[PDB]
Amino acid sequence: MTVAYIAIGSNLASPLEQVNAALKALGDIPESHILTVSSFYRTPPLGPQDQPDYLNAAVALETSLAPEELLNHTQRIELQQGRVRKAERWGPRTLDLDIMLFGNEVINTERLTVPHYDMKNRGFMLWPLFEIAPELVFPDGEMLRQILHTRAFDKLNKW
Ligand SMILES: Nc1ncnc2c1ncn2[C@@H]1O[C@H](COP(=O)(O)OP(=O)(O)OP(=O)(O)O)[C@@H](O)[C@H]1O
Ligand SMILES: Nc1nc2[nH]c(SCc3ccc(Cl)cc3)nc2c(=O)[nH]1
Ligand SMILES: [Ca+2]
Ligand SMILES: [Ca+2]
Ligand SMILES: [Ca+2]
Ligand SMILES: [Ca+2]
Ligand code: NA
């Protein structure tokens, strides 16, 4: 087994219902078990700002799936919950499931880059992560607690 950490975001079509559906779906992924779910946070959109606020959360998922097999499940859940690709970069969505971490692995394939390329710069990923994994160390040996102590990250509000 390995523990994967998944970032959850929704800003369309009733985020709270999309996130609660998605946690039921994540549970139904084979060879995999939810271990912890963070609080839900209401976060102002980064990138384009002319969109609703996000519900952001994180989940620890223990799995013996291969990492791209986990990605096939998360992308399926997203598509099943009405995720459509528009041309706008970083536009709104009903659900986004980003694989943050897959144990201590570093993965660079055609479809999957882990760690998530920009997570150490995003408080809406790091704060929920720290709530479920305060002791987390990244594959490069960086400590999640150290990143949040040393870097300026706005405080997150609960949904
Ligand atoms: N760690 C990962 N988690 C999820 N998808 C990934 C990951 N690494 C690469 N991808 C690939 O990213 C593609 C584009 O995803 P998407 O449109 O959701 O980007 P985004 O989540 O909006 O932006 P960002 O990555 O900046 O948060 C997916 O089809 C998938 O192949
Ligand atoms: N709060 C919130 N804002 C979001 N923006 C996106 S698109 C990625 C992105 C694009 C540019 C920058 Cl600089 C940072 C993030 N996803 C979320 C999300 O889940 N939560
Ligand atoms: Ca399961
Ligand atoms: Ca826009
Ligand atoms: Ca995504
Ligand atoms: Ca994303
Ligand atoms: Na298998």
From Swiss-Prot:
GO molecular function: 2-amino-4-hydroxy-6-hydroxymethyldihydropteridine diphosphokinase activity; ATP binding; kinase activity; magnesium ion binding
UniProt pathway: Cofactor biosynthesis; tetrahydrofolate biosynthesis; 2-amino-4-hydroxy-6-hydroxymethyl-7,8-dihydropteridine diphosphate from 7,8-dihydroneopterin triphosphate: step 4/4
Alphabetized UniProt keyword annotations: ATP-binding, Folate biosynthesis, Kinase, Nucleotide-binding, Transferase
Name of the top EC class for this enzyme: transferase
PROSITE patterns: HPPK (PS00794)
InterPro entries per record: Hppk, Hppk_sf
Organism domain of life: Bacteria
EC number(s) stated in the UniProt entry for this protein: 2.7.6.3
Pfam families documented for this protein: HPPK
UniProt catalytic activity: 6-hydroxymethyl-7,8-dihydropterin + ATP = (7,8-dihydropterin-6-yl)methyl diphosphate + AMP + H(+)
Temperature dependence of activity: Thermostable. Retains 75% of its activity after heating 30 minutes at 96 degrees Celsius.
GO process terms (BP): folic acid biosynthetic process; tetrahydrofolate biosynthetic process
Family of the protein in this entry: Belongs to the HPPK family.
Summary of subunit composition and partner proteins: Monomer.
Function: Catalyzes the transfer of pyrophosphate from adenosine triphosphate (ATP) to 6-hydroxymethyl-7,8-dihydropterin, an enzymatic step in folate biosynthesis pathway.
Protein name: 2-amino-4-hydroxy-6-hydroxymethyldihydropteridine pyrophosphokinase
Gene responsible for this protein: folK
